[PDB]
Amino acid sequence: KVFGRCELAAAMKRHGLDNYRGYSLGNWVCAAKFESNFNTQATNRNTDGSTDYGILQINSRWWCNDGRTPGSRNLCNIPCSALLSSDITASVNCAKKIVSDGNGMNAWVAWRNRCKGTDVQAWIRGCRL
Template identity: 70%
Template sequence: MKCQIHVFGGLLVILAFASGKQYERCELARDMKIYGLDGFRGYSLPNWVCAAFYESSFNTASINFNPGDNSTDYGILQINSRWWCEDFKTPRSHNACNINCKALLSDDITESVKCAKRVVSDPQGMEAWVAWRNHCKGKDLSNWIRGCKLTEDLL
């Protein structure tokens, strides 16, 4: 019986980690604003929310493997292991954010935002995110924050 409890408890821990946080649109917009993404490097908050939706469906635990270069995208903004983080699996990883990719899967998006700021500071800007290029760039993105209470003091 004791062994069954430990196994069951271990499975719960794994399932809790694997599921991540599923953000609601306005909740993510609020957190991204708090972390300083609104206007960062000239990209408005709706750009970031749109990118997160098309990259991960607002899920912090999203992981996607890229067979073309054997890299993996991690977290709510699908930050790539070839260039930005270290997952100890990707050949020739640059790890420009100097971070373990697992940190990008946290319910707390602090590390994801820090790394995203590093990504967007490169000459490519938000063009680094294919989903942003295909779904958000040059579009009216006002609906991504419409109805969200973002004007009051968030801190």
């Protein structure tokens, strides 16, 4: 599923991400745009052999099991394929664990390079929330 901007903002708010660990909703929408272009089916391969999955590009080296990343962890205890669903519950629940692990949203490279320090509130302008 390819979400609309305000459609995704409303889904993330319903799942408890607005101000989760101090990160306003615009931060999460901005990260999703630049990680995946709002596409739940996005996948990308890393140099080390791991793969990033879903709307928030969660990495199989640490967070999910895809059966082909040897010596990796599965800290969210889920198959990586679950992160590609049109239902974002699994991606959101895992993201809550990631952002609590010490580095906040710096775990998302595109957030650090394209969202951090910008006016992220603009990503939710005009949305009925």
